[PDB]
Design a protein around this ligand. Structure first.
Ligand SMILES: [Ca+2]
Ligand SMILES: [Ca+2]
Lengths: 43, 195
């Protein structure tokens, strides 16, 4: 198509910190909030 | 006696934790009374045997996050102080939001706090950074869902070996900080599910 390729510094390659921090920040945020509480049987 | 139980985060559990990091009304004070009441009947602090009373830790694949979220590996009870510092650490940035003069800038959920938070979660040994035994325990429990054994062993060794920026073969604050400069995860640490 138009344009070319291998021009100026294109996008950087994937990063381990990004993929892991994205799934970790999402799983850890909703994982620790799912706690909340309001269910003490007090039996 | 026994029952279907099956808990769920309804607008009550959501609104509660939401105001914890969203505001600070009594909606959470009560939530702390039941949660802290799980102390076998103490009503002051919470230990590991108490958090398991919730269907989240007892069903979490890592949970090393919740465990170190209330207190590190040294104390056997978390007081109300961290109770609200952890559940509220998810407050959305509003002071450094480009502004330079709000009206009540308290230290919580700030950049340096973002690292200190995700840190406590992965800081199981307290080496000051996420060691390979810690990072791997999670990284593997996060990808092992579809990664073979020798495949994971090589994906974990290369993961901690390629991100090793402090060269400590461990990470927590350094390539993490360098990663925030590319993604404002500081505001992501906020629950909403609205839009
Ligand atoms: Ca550590
Ligand atoms: Ca490092």
């Amino acid at each position: 198509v138009d344009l070319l390729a291998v021009k100026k510094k294109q996008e950087t390659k994937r990063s381990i910190n990004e993929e892991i921090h994205t799934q970790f920040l999402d799983h850890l945020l909703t994982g620790i909030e799912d706690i909340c509480g309001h269910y003490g049987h007090h039996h | 006696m026994g029952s279907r139980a099956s808990t769920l985060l309804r607008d009550e559990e959501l609104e509660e934790i939401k105001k914890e990091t969203g505001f600070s009304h009594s909606q959470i004070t009560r939530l702390y009374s039941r949660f802290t009441s799980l102390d076998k009947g103490e009503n002051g602090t919470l230990s590991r045997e108490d958090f398991q009373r919730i269907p989240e830790l007892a069903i979490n694949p890592l949970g090393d996050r919740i465990i170190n979220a209330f207190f590190p590996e040294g104390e056997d009870q978390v007081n109300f102080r961290g109770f609200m510092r952890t559940l509220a650490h998810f407050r959305p940035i509003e002071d450094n939001e480009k502004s330079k003069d709000v009206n009540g800038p308290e230290p919580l959920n700030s950049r340096s706090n973002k690292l200190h938070f995700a840190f406590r979660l992965y800081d199981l040994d307290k080496d000051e950074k996420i060691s390979r035994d810690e990072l791997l325990q999670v990284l593997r429990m996060m990808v092992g869902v579809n990664i073979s054994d020798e495949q994971l062993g090589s994906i974990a060794d290369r993961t901690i070996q390629e991100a090793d920026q402090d060269g400590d073969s461990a990470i927590s604050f350094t390539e993490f900080v360098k990663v925030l400069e590319k993604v404002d995860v500081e505001q992501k640490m906020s629950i909403r599910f609205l839009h």
